[PDB]
Nucleic acid binder design. Structure first.
Ligand SMILES: Nc1ncnc2c1ncn2[C@@H]1O[C@H](CSCC[C@H](N)C(=O)O)[C@@H](O)[C@H]1O
Ligand SMILES: Nc1ncnc2c1ncn2[C@@H]1O[C@H](CSCC[C@H](N)C(=O)O)[C@@H](O)[C@H]1O
Lengths: 285, 194, 285, 182
DNA sequence: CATGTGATCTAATTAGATCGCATGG
DNA sequence: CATGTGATCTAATTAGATCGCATG
């Protein structure tokens, strides 16, 4: 009979600290949140929105085995490597082994470094996320280096946006059915500011590019405001992703800087569903 | 662990070869008897962990970049990542006390970016091996101690650079230099003769 | 006795609806709030941040005496006309009789239209704001047309910014000493986001242009963040002006569009100090 | 029958000569510089039955913008209006001598709550005036367009500066409200 | 037979440097 | 004499359109 301890997390390619946001939202106590990230806008968002709790370590390639043992142990290793060279939306993608695609192997490397030795059965959980719209050869290789097959979770089931994502990991009940919580805004209208009308129930996948906010190849505007068409506002994008309103209203970021952060990040209700069974393994409230 | 074995308790070495069958190298130094202990893998894109395990235990894991040529179906970093992946598949359970070695050899095909990926994933900088009578050269990564303690003719990677670029442009393996890296292993496993 | 009634306000050059915001912060019940404003950005802020409570009537010059009769009566008429052709900071200022400077006489005109006729002793209050840094002749002409002298209220006494403003009007106790509320943030440090250091106690007057965000003729940065110099973020500007954080995080506005709205507006604590005695004249929650 | 003498406050131009041509302790008050004239000044200058103001003609002697004369006109007019208990009639008078531009003209109509009547003279130039008296707006006059008056305004700048031949034709139908010296 | 954790074009905005001097401190 | 509810000019950065095609 041993009381559960607060969680120690290693988050690679942290972005805007969605992992720490979801863990706090679940009441899971966090002893350590070590994040490797290089974009200063993202680091500023994480530093501000979590009051210096996150500790940044820089480039994922600067993190050695020795660093993992000094800063460890870790109970949770999470990350989603860049996909601009993986996703088939980029006709100039350099693949899994070139460009930014090869940063995946840094995750596989640090995961191997952070795994408990054979014989140590302490609780250890990991999650790797990336896009479904990737090359078949690149998905096969990702699964073999991680030695697991992914589960496909589309954010459309618990939010107002399509976002089919692959998730490799060992978290409990990763493949259990998705639950539409009362905290989920399932339709675009529920994420819009006052005085604005949605033209679509669900919005298509939001990338970092403005053309993804408009719908279809005909570039249909998503919302109306007193009979004039308009794209989504930043606060509305955050609500579509499940972030607190004005989460990214930080550091004088432009609209497109804010969308670059959001377009690369996770759907918050999806991560909350994935992280939810973790609260039976670590200290809470 | 860099401890020596008494000669009478040296067992024949079990070698896993990837991207190269180094039979002729290892037979020529008395590591294998010429009977009917070395597994060569055709292509590693589908071998899982259970495969490396069912291929029996391994004492040495070898992988190498193909020499300058067109048998680059894959990008040069693919051979390194795949070598690292199956290397962990072939590591002994942390209880076993027998000697275990690995080595990855580069025929000057990786560029600077692939070289730092190399030294970070295998956790050591490459020892470059030159061939004088200034012909060829190779960089090697391995836990073999006498490849880190012995001192071959040092070469500037800029001298290697001139060669490397020139050799790549000029467009089999340097058997003499890969053979030399195996000799300090004779003190750990069984030796055979003619 | 006779119970007090909600206030009916005519707000000319309403901007980002500082008038309605301060009235609601004071708990004063507002029957109707009619706003004359032309800037679509300004109107969107007010529409959103007050759930369509504000009724917009457009250009101040299209508001006739007939409209005042239909829409009235009003208990409060407030306004601050554009000062780009009034403030000596513009060497190309066209004066009070040209450019946008003449829009002051529209306030004078509508103030006359809305005044109770002689004999009608219903409570009637009005306020006109503009900059101290105007010409002697132009200030003289404003006081003659409104038939009263202004009072000088510098926002530096209740906020983290210099803003010496003139206020014409008949509000109760416009000359009473200015007291620092405990919810006032007097120092710049209190307005900054986490992890940032203020280099100044009070900043200089914030206009619509970013050179006013840097201090002195030397244009010093006001903030250090991890030993790197930086300007104020928009949320920090909002805190300096006293608005709710993210008040202007609306309509995909740039940092510049947001600073234009704030640079033209009122210091919220100053208006709260000016509006506070109205609580004894109208219904409050 | 009981028609008291008129009390006329003139602004920016003394009308003495033209209104004495109709014979209207002088009854008139002429104001030097209105900029410092307050309400108590107009109030202590006795009651007023008609207030008059005018733009200067195309030419100098004006250090002000053409809009300054109206705003000041509109200001001191309401200073001079009587309380609703006053049964005596009250009228005002503001006439333009082609100096107002279009942008400046709409300010006139909105601030005075009516559009101007156009009055020409062909043998000179023309003028336009706003006023509540029922004898200009009701009685039909020579209707022209503001565009041919624009050609006469360019013809005004062409030639140069006086309007009084037509200005007198305006203050005429006021004698049926005050005294008359013939 | 639609679709996309992007990218490359443009023409439109924005950020920073600079200019400005009457004024009341 | 430091200051300013601005404005102009100029590289910088954003919108916005368009381009891609492997894959589920
Ligand atoms: N070399 C590197 N080291 C660490 N992070 C890197 C990196 N190269 C790119 N990144 C970061 O990896 C991130 C992948 S986008 C993933 C962000 C995260 N899923 C979220 O929810 O916010 C990007 O933010 C990018 O800035
Ligand atoms: N012709 C016009 N009619 C109505 N409003 C106008 C106008 N011309 C300019 N304005 C508006 O007048 C405002 C002056 S700045 C005053 C803003 C207000 N005091 C606030 O607290 O936000 C600006 O917002 C400008 O858009």
């Amino acid at each position: 009979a041993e009381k559960r301890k607060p969680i120690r997390v290693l988050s690679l390619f942290d972005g805007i600290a969605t992992g720490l946001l979801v863990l706090k939202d679940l009441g899971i106590q966090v002893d350590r949140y070590i994040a490797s990230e290089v974009c200063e806008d993202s680091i500023t968002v994480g530093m501000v929105r979590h009051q210096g709790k996150i500790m940044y370590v820089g480039d994922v390639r600067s993190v050695t085995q020795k660093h993992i043992q000094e800063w460890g142990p870790f109970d949770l290793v999470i990350g989603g490597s860049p996909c601009n060279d993986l996703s088939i939306v980029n006709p100039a993608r350099k693949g899994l082994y070139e460009g930014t695609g090869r940063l995946f192997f840094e995750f596989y490397r640090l995961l191997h470094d952070a795994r408990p030795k054979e014989g140590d059965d302490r609780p250890f959980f990991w999650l790797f996320e990336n896009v479904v719209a990737m090359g078949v050869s690149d998905k096969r290789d990702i699964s073999r280096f991680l030695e697991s097959n992914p589960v496909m979770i589309d954010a459309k089931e618990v939010s107002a946006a399509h976002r089919a994502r692959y998730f490799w990991g060992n978290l409990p009940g990763m493949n259990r059915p998705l639950a539409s919580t009362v905290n989920d805004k399932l339709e675009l209208q529920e994420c819009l500011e006052h005085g604005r009308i949605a033209k679509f129930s669900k919005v298509r996948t939001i990338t970092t590019r403005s053309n993804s906010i408009k719908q279809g190849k005909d570039q249909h505007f998503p919302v109306f405001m007193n009979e004039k068409e308009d794209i989504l506002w930043c606060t509305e994008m955050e609500r579509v992703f499940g972030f607190p309103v004005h989460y990214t209203d930080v550091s004088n970021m432009s609209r497109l800087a804010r969308q670059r952060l959001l377009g690369r990040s996770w759907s918050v209700p999806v991560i909350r569903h994935l992280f939810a069974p973790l609260k039976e393994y670590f200290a809470c409230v | 662990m860099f401890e020596t074995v008494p000669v009478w308790r040296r067992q024949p070495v079990r070698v896993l070869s990837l991207f190269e069958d180094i039979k002729k190298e290892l037979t020529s130094l008395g590591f294998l008897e010429s009977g009917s202990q070395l597994k060569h893998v055709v292509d590693v894109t589908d071998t899982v962990r259970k495969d490396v395990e069912e291929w029996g235990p391994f004492d040495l894991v070898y992988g190498a970049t193909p020499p300058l040529g067109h048998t680059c179906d894959r990008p040069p970093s693919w051979y390194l990542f795949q070598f690292h992946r199956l290397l962990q598949y072939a590591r002994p359970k942390p209880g076993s006390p027998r000697p275990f070695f690995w080595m990855f050899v580069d025929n000057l095909v990786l560029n600077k970016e692939d070289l730092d990926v190399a030294s970070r994933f295998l956790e050591m900088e490459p020892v470059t091996i030159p061939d004088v009578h200034l012909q060829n050269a190779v960089r090697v990564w391995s836990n073999i101690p006498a490849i880190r303690s012995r001192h071959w003719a040092l070469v500037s990677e800029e001298e290697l650079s001139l060669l490397a670029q020139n050799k790549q442009s000029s467009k089999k393996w340097p058997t003499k230099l890969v053979k030399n890296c195996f000799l300090p292993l004779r003190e750990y496993f069984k030796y055979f003769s003619t």
